[PDB]
């Protein structure tokens, strides 16, 4: 019984208590996990994401949520077995952010790939902090 609560406490931290967006997507593209940093970037809840996909091709009607998420995620490569890293600008809610994107594939042993762990870091958010602090101390000089 104690083993379950420790996992629950671990999930509480992983989902409600990690600052950078992180997600887990299976082989077929279904989203298994995403923390609040992921969800709050788009202002949605887990019920709108878990078990659902971010298709590579454009969906009829140009649905906004899938469109916005596609920009932050990385394309689905032909079963890649090595980490990936990219950085780009993404525009959302009238604000353009420089983001550092990453994905790590995983398997159930036996060499069998089952999904990818991924996420991104908002670089602009860090630069804004440094810029605001530098402008502050400078204004005091």
Curated annotation (Swiss-Prot):
Domain spans labelled PAS: 7-78
PTM annotation: Activation requires a sequential transfer of a phosphate group from a His in the primary transmitter domain, to an Asp in the receiver domain and to a His in the secondary transmitter domain.
Subcellular location: Cell inner membrane
Residues annotated as domain PAC: 79-135
Function: Member of the two-component regulatory system BvgS/BvgA. Phosphorylates BvgA via a four-step phosphorelay in response to environmental signals.
Name of the protein: Virulence sensor protein BvgS
Organism of provenance: Bordetella pertussis (strain Tohama I / ATCC BAA-589 / NCTC 13251)
Gene, per the UniProt record: bvgS
Stretch of the intact protein here: 574 to 714 of 1238
């Amino acid at each position: 019984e104690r083993a379950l609560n420790d996992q629950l406490e671990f999930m509480r931290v992983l989902i409600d208590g990690t600052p950078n967006p992180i997600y887990v997507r299976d082989k077929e593209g279904r989203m298994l996990l995403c923390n609040d940093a992921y969800l709050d970037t788009f202002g949605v809840t887990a019920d709108a994401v878990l078990g659902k996909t971010i298709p590579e091709a454009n969906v009829v009607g140009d649905p906004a949520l899938a469109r916005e998420m596609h920009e932050f995620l990385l394309t689905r490569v032909a079963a890649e077995r090595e980490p990936r890293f990219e950085d780009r600008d993404v525009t959302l809610h009238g604000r353009t952010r420089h983001v550092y994107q990453w994905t790590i594939p995983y398997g159930d042993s036996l060499g069998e790939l089952k999904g990818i762990i991924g996420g991104w870091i908002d670089i602009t958010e860090r630069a804004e902090l440094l810029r605001k602090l530098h402008d502050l101390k400078e204004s005091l000089d």
